Amino acid sequence: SLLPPTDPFRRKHEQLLLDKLYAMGVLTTKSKISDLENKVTVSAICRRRLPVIMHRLKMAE
Amino acid sequence: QNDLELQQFLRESHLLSAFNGIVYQDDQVIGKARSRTLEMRLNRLSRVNGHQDKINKLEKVPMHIRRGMIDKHVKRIKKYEQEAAEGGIVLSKVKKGQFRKIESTYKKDIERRIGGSIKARDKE
Amino acid sequence: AEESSFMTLFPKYRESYLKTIWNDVTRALDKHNIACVLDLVEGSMTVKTTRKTYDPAIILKARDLIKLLARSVPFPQAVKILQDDMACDVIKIGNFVTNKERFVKRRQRLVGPNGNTLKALELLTKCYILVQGNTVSAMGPFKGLKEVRRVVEDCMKNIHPIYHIKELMIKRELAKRPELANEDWSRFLPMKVYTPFPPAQLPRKVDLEI
Amino acid sequence: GRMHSAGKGISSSAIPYSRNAPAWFKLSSESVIEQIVKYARKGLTPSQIGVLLRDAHGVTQARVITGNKIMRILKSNGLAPEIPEDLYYLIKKAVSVRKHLERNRKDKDAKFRLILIESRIHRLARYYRTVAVLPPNWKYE
Amino acid sequence: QVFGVARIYASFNDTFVHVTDLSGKETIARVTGGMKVKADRDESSPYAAMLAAQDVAAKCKEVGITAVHVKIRATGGTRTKTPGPGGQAALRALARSGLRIGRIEDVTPVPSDSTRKKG
RNA sequence: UUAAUAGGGACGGUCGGGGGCAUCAGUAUUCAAUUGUCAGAGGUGAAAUUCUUGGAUUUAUUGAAGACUAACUACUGCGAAAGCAUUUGCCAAGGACGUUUUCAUUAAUCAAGAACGAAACUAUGCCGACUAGGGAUCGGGUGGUGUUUUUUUAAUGACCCACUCGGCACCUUACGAGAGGAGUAUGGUCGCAAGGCUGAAACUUAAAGGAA
Numbered sequence A: 001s002l003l004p005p006t007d008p009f010r011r012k013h014e015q016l017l018l019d020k021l022y023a024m025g026v027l028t029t030k031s032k033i034s035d036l037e038n039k040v041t042v043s044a045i046c047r048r049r050l051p052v053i054m055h056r057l058k059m060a061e
Numbered sequence B: 001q002n003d004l005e006l007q008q009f010l011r012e013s014h015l016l017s018a019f020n021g022i023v024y025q026d027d028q029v030i031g032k033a034r035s036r037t038l039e040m041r042l043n044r045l046s047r048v049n050g051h052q053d054k055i056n057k058l059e060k061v062p063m064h065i066r067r068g069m070i071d072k073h074v075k076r077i078k079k080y081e082q083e084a085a086e087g088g089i090v091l092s093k094v095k096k097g098q099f100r101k102i103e104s105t106y107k108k109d110i111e112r113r114i115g116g117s118i119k120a121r122d123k124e
Numbered sequence C: 001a002e003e004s005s006f007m008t009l010f011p012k013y014r015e016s017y018l019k020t021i022w023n024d025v026t027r028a029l030d031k032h033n034i035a036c037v038l039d040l041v042e043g044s045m046t047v048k049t050t051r052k053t054y055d056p057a058i059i060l061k062a063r064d065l066i067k068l069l070a071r072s073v074p075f076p077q078a079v080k081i082l083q084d085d086m087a088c089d090v091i092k093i094g095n096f097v098t099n100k101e102r103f104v105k106r107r108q109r110l111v112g113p114n115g116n117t118l119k120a121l122e123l124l125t126k127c128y129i130l131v132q133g134n135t136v137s138a139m140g141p142f143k144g145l146k147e148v149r150r151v152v153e154d155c156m157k158n159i160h161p162i163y164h165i166k167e168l169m170i171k172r173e174l175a176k177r178p179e180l181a182n183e184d185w186s187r188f189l190p191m192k193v194y195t196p197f198p199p200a201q202l203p204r205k206v207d208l209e210i
Numbered sequence D: 001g002r003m004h005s006a007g008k009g010i011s012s013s014a015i016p017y018s019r020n021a022p023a024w025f026k027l028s029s030e031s032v033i034e035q036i037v038k039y040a041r042k043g044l045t046p047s048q049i050g051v052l053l054r055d056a057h058g059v060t061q062a063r064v065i066t067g068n069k070i071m072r073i074l075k076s077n078g079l080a081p082e083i084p085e086d087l088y089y090l091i092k093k094a095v096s097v098r099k100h101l102e103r104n105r106k107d108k109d110a111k112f113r114l115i116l117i118e119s120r121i122h123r124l125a126r127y128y129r130t131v132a133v134l135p136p137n138w139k140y141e
Numbered sequence E: 001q002v003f004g005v006a007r008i009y010a011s012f013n014d015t016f017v018h019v020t021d022l023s024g025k026e027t028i029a030r031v032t033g034g035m036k037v038k039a040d041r042d043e044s045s046p047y048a049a050m051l052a053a054q055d056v057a058a059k060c061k062e063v064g065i066t067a068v069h070v071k072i073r074a075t076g077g078t079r080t081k082t083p084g085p086g087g088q089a090a091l092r093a094l095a096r097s098g099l100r101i102g103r104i105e106d107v108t109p110v111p112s113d114s115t116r117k118k119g
Numbered sequence F: 001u002u003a004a005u006a007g008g009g010a011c012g013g014u015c016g017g018g019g020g021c022a023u024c025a026g027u028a029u030u031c032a033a034u035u036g037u038c039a040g041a042g043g044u045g046a047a048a049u050u051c052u053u054g055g056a057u058u059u060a061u062u063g064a065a066g067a068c069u070a071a072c073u074a075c076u077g078c079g080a081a082a083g084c085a086u087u088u089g090c091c092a093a094g095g096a097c098g099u100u101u102u103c104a105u106u107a108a109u110c111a112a113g114a115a116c117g118a119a120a121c122u123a124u125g126c127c128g129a130c131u132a133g134g135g136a137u138c139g140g141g142u143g144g145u146g147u148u149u150u151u152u153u154a155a156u157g158a159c160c161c162a163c164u165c166g167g168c169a170c171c172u173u174a175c176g177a178g179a180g181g182a183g184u185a186u187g188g189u190c191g192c193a194a195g196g197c198u199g200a201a202a203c204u205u206a207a208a209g210g211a212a
């Protein structure tokens, strides 16, 4: 964020990080760069654990 | 007077010097100078239409700390003003209630904690 | 090989600060084999050459150093005078105007609101500027010092320094484009007879009755 | 409280509370009166007469020592000024300034002071004319 | 040791290196930075002053002088009272060239009262 | 009758970069005269313009002209304000202080009237008839003390402390009836405006260009 807003390097890396985290499932949306601070949380990572995903897929009660 | 780039540079000159040719352009400026520059601009625009209470809020600090922070800062200002007074140095005018903005104010980000002035004394 | 020495008196209020930094001043001057003396009885600072002094012109810079310290310049800023590129200049400003109120307003104009004008000039000229009394003290590179003098003198002649700050900002951008180096930059820059005896006084109403 | 000036000085004499002659004074009341007459005959003004008597003859106040003021003592023996002493001095200060202005025509400051001096003469001359000490037809120059 | 006087005039835009006899009437060698450089922008550079100093130093040794007294000055008058960069560099070059320096003084014209209009 | 911690005048030693007229000095600038040397010198961000082998710039000696009164220069002094900074003399004027000197209410505020008299461009301080103060400083006076000072030539101060009157400001305190901004929308009115290669239209028309 402290790099200048029009920097090509800043935009590239920020999109790559958004691309990767969304693929893992930690981030629900790729639209907003501010999500890297506000919506990056331990609960987001824990919510991708196998027991939780089984619960959401209704494989377990 | 209506040149935005020129007026912006003058108001922000204190921050740019503290956190430093001089990179005053928006694309060149990086680091804390960018973060402190953006916050100052947004506060300036918000002051016109936003309510005074909501726009500016001092960060929560315990009393024994903040009163200590204010006391030490006031002592620094008094030494700075006295030293200039003993010499011939001319200093920028300040309103009665307000604290003078010495170099330490910008570098140490004191204003976010102590505030521009003691609001209780201003109210009475 | 006689020793060349220079002396400069300093105010009593600066005695406390000079005493603390003298070891730093001694160390800085010792690198060039220059001896220094601080007399707190006479309130003077002396710098002299030694038998190991090899740079003939360093004594002049050491003299400027003690002058700056006496004029309330901090040592970290003052010590830079020993560098070859750096220089110091004093600009008189008391003679430009005859009205005290006009003098104060124009001087305050140089400092500007919250010191913004002064800080911007220092940033653009890369000079340390101190406005004191009827003189403006500047320290920095020779190109910067020349620019500072024009702004300070023009300020006392009713030209707002903000015009010079804008002119300095544009000039730096112009210097970075080669195609226009040869071309002039003026286009891009902002543009009855007196009587000795008083008349008589009108009589009061009571005088008329008398 | 100065008129024609911003000064607020309060320097003045403090007449002593008691109105009797000092105990240490041991000179006849009459002998003071002849002393007053001689000085006035020589040409001294009443203010100057009092200073000499006080400085050198132990006369604290003529009224206290003799019971009458110097002005009445002199008038009782035929010595009386043509015009009051304060007006007497004010006219000369105007004359001296006017003489100076004649040679120095560019002294605008002296012109300003001559206005203040003359205005003071008009106020004083008005008072004495009211009390009849000065004849009604009298005018300054 | 034969003593001369090296009169240095260090302006912002140029530097004069001038050596004369003690009286000052007899000029011995006058060399300027503009003589030693190809561009007007570089007359005041320390490099130009150094070149002028060495040539003056070589000429002085030929005449017979082995030492000099230095009298550095600036433009003075109502202008700056500070010598330019060339003055310091020229002074160093003279010592390097081998001429002994006798005494150093600032003789910049300092007006008692400048010809500047208050109005 | 008092002789207002009302007013005026007088006297005593003083204070002032207050005013007027002469007078003196100073370095600087410009010019000129000689004077050594030779190709640059000023100025700009670069230049252009200007001076220059008939000697510029620069060096040394000397003379003249106009202006000015640097550093000392201070949140100091004087003046009603505008303003006033070299020395000496003259001319009057003024402030405060000191007085056991003098007149005795002669005073205060005042529309009218009278005298004097390129620029701005970031600021700002609740106000008053209003209490008690603190430090520093300027001018005067009183007292104390002991260091500078000095001695029957004449003059005869500086510093320290205490009090007091009057000033320029600074930091504090008790009291008082002191009676529009920022925007949004527009089937209205008035203006400005779109386009299609130019030549080239009454001419499907040349050369040369534009685009590609």
Ligand SMILES: [Mg+2]
Residues within 6 Å of the ligand: F003
């Ligand atoms: Mg009385």
Ligand SMILES: [Mg+2]
Residues within 6 Å of the ligand: none
């Ligand atoms: Mg009087």
Ligand SMILES: [Mg+2]
Residues within 6 Å of the ligand: none
């Ligand atoms: Mg007197």
Ligand SMILES: [Mg+2]
Residues within 6 Å of the ligand: none
């Ligand atoms: Mg006088």
Ligand SMILES: [Mg+2]
Residues within 6 Å of the ligand: none
């Ligand atoms: Mg005079």
Ligand SMILES: [Mg+2]
Residues within 6 Å of the ligand: none
């Ligand atoms: Mg003259």
Ligand SMILES: [Mg+2]
Residues within 6 Å of the ligand: none
């Ligand atoms: Mg004069």
Ligand SMILES: [Mg+2]
Residues within 6 Å of the ligand: F077
């Ligand atoms: Mg004075």
Ligand SMILES: [Mg+2]
Residues within 6 Å of the ligand: none
């Ligand atoms: Mg005054």
Ligand SMILES: [Mg+2]
Residues within 6 Å of the ligand: F069, F086
């Ligand atoms: Mg002087």
Ligand SMILES: [Mg+2]
Residues within 6 Å of the ligand: none
């Ligand atoms: Mg007082």
